[PDB]
Design an enzyme around this catalytic site. Structure first.
Site, short mmCIF file in Angstrom:
data_model
loop_
_atom_site.label_atom_id
_atom_site.label_comp_id
_atom_site.label_asym_id
_atom_site.label_seq_id
_atom_site.Cartn_x
_atom_site.Cartn_y
_atom_site.Cartn_z
N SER B 49 61.52 15.54 48.29
CA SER B 49 60.07 15.31 48.29
C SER B 49 59.36 15.45 46.95
O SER B 49 58.19 15.08 46.85
CB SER B 49 59.36 16.13 49.38
OG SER B 49 59.79 15.63 50.64
N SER B 97 53.90 17.10 52.94
CA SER B 97 55.15 16.41 52.62
C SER B 97 55.56 15.40 53.71
O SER B 97 56.71 15.38 54.17
CB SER B 97 56.27 17.42 52.29
OG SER B 97 57.13 16.84 51.34
N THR B 188 56.87 20.81 46.10
CA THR B 188 58.17 21.29 46.56
C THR B 188 59.10 20.14 46.95
O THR B 188 58.66 19.01 47.16
CB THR B 188 58.01 22.21 47.83
OG1 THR B 188 57.09 21.60 48.75
CG2 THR B 188 57.47 23.63 47.46
N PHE B 190 63.25 19.58 49.11
CA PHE B 190 64.37 20.19 49.86
C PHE B 190 65.22 19.05 50.41
O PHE B 190 64.77 18.32 51.31
CB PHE B 190 63.81 21.08 50.99
CG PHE B 190 64.86 21.69 51.91
CD1 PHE B 190 66.07 22.22 51.40
CD2 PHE B 190 64.61 21.78 53.29
CE1 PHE B 190 67.01 22.80 52.26
CE2 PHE B 190 65.55 22.37 54.16
CZ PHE B 190 66.75 22.89 53.64
N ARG B 232 62.53 29.13 46.65
CA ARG B 232 62.24 28.03 45.72
C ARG B 232 60.87 28.25 45.06
O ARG B 232 60.62 27.76 43.96
CB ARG B 232 62.34 26.65 46.40
CG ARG B 232 61.13 26.29 47.25
CD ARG B 232 61.38 25.06 48.10
NE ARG B 232 60.35 24.95 49.15
CZ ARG B 232 60.20 23.88 49.93
NH1 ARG B 232 60.96 22.80 49.76
NH2 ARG B 232 59.26 23.88 50.86
#
Lengths: 247, 246
Positions: B49, B97, B188, B190, B232
Site C-alpha cells: 500500500s 488503505s 503504511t 503490508f 512497523r
C-alpha cells in the site's frame, strides 16, 4: 450557506463556563447551519489572529510570501512572545500565531492591494483603517461568525480569488489535528481583555473533513480575563464531540 | 541520494523486538542519509500500500481522479475489509488503505500510462508486470527504502513530473499527525505474512516537517505474523523520538 437555525442543545456548554458566546456549525452536504445564538452569529468582531488566514493567502498571491517553503527569519530583536523569537515556516508562523511576521507581510502587501483582496474575499466590513499593520488587531475591521464560515467554505472549495496552489498551501498550513477518519483545519484569535464593561473577543474558526462530510465552524466569545482563553477551543470541541464529529 | 552512513545506535530498537528490518532517515535532503543497515537500505521489496502515493499522483495527473474533492462511491459489493465498504474521499481512501479504490484507478490509468509515470518518478525497478490491478500487491514491482526517501523528497519539493497542484493535493492527503511544532506525512504498507522461510514485508514511509527542518524516512521489516504489524510504526517512532524529531 443555504440555511441557518437556532438550537438550544449546546447552551449548557456555555452556561457551565459562564461564557457569553456563539457557535456556528455548517454541514456542507445540506448547506445547513446551526447556532446557539442567531443574533450573535451576525454580530461583527475584530478578527485578531483569525486574519492570518486571508493575510497568508494575500501574502502568497501578491508574491510577498515566495512559496510554501518560505522561512521567515528572526532578526534577533525581542518580540512580545518568546515563542515568536525564532525562524518560522508559514505553518509555524500561523500555528504559534507570530503576529509580527504577518504585520511585515501586511506592510509589504500595502493598502491598495489589501483593500482589493478583502473586497474580492467579501471579508467582513472590509474596513482596513487603523494602520496597515494593525487594522485587524486594534483597527476598524469587523467580521461575523456567519461570514467566517462563508469565507472558509470558499477557501475549502478553492473558490477564493487566488490561485488554487495558494489556497492549497494555506489549507495545509491550517491543519491542527489529523485522525484516520477526520482532518481539522483551524485558527484561533484573541483581541485582548478589553475591559469588564467592554470585553475583548476570542475566536476559534475552521473546518472538519469527516468521512465524506465537511463541517465549517466559527466560535467567538466575550473575554475579559486571559485565564479564560482555553474555553475558545474547549466549548466548541465539546459541542463537536457531542455531535459525533470529532473525538 | 549522496551518501548513506551506518548508525549502530538504533540497533537496540530492532533487537529488542527480534525484528529484521531497516530504517533510513535523512535530515534536510537525501544528500546524506543514515541507516542501521547499509545493505538492506538499498534492498528492493514489494511496495504494497505504499504504492498508494504514486498511484494517487498518477490518478490525478491522468484525470482518472477528477480533482481534490473526488468521492469514490462504494457500489455496495463486498470488499476485503469492512472499513472499505463506504464512500471515501482521496484522503479517506489513502488513510484506510482502500485497495479496491486504487485497483480501479490503476485499471483506468492503464499499463502504458502507468509504465510511463513510474519511469518519470524513477519508482523502484519500475516493473509493472503481474496484472495492472495487482503488480504492487503480488507482482514484480520492487522498491528500496533509499528509493522511497528519494521519491518522497521529490514530492515534498514539488519536483515530481506532475502539476504542483496535484502534488499538493496528495501531500495533504498524506498528513497523519499534526502538532504545533511538527507535521507528519506518512503511509503504511503490508504485503502479507508469506511463510517463515519467505516472510512478507511491512513498511512505514513519510517525512516530518519540524520547526524549519524536514526529515525524510522509510522503514521496512520482515513479517510472518500479523501480530507484529504495529512494530512497523513503533520501531521508527521510537528511533525518531530518540533523535528529538517527534
Amino acid at each position: 450557506m443555504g440555511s441557518i437555525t437556532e438550537n438550544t442543545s449546546w447552551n449548557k456548554e456555555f452556561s457551565a463556563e459562564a461564557v457569553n458566546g456563539v457557535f456556528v456549525l455548517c454541514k456542507s452536504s445540506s448547506k445547513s447551519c446551526a447556532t446557539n445564538d442567531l443574533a450573535r452569529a451576525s454580530k461583527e468582531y475584530l478578527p485578531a489572529s483569525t486574519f492570518k488566514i486571508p493575510n497568508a493567502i494575500i501574502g502568497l498571491e501578491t508574491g510577498v510570501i515566495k512559496n510554501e517553503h518560505q522561512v521567515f527569519k528572526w532578526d534577533g530583536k525581542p518580540r512580545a512572545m518568546k515563542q515568536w523569537e525564532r525562524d518560522l515556516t508559514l505553518r509555524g508562523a500561523i500555528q504559534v500565531s507570530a503576529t509580527p511576521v504577518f504585520q511585515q507581510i501586511a506592510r509589504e502587501v500595502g493598502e491598495v492591494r489589501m483593500q482589493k483582496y478583502l473586497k474580492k474575499f467579501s471579508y467582513g466590513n472590509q474596513n482596513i483603517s487603523g494602520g496597515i499593520d494593525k487594522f485587524w488587531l486594534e483597527g476598524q475591521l469587523r467580521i461575523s461568525a456567519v461570514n467566517q464560515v462563508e469565507f472558509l467554505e470558499s477557501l475549502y472549495l478553492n473558490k477564493l480569488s487566488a490561485s488554487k496552489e495558494n489556497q492549497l498551501i494555506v489549507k495545509e498550513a491550517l491543519v491542527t489535528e489529523a485522525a484516520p477518519e477526520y482532518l481539522v483545519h483551524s485558527k484561533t484569535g484573541f483581541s485582548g481583555v478589553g475591559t469588564e464593561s467592554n470585553p475583548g473577543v476570542a475566536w476559534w474558526v475552521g473546518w472538519v473533513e469527516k468521512e465524506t462530510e465537511v463541517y465549517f465552524f466559527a466560535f467567538n466569545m466575550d473575554i475579559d480575563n486571559e485565564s479564560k482563553l482555553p474555553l475558545r477551543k474547549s466549548i466548541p470541541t465539546k459541542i463537536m464531540e457531542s455531535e459525533g464529529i470529532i473525538g
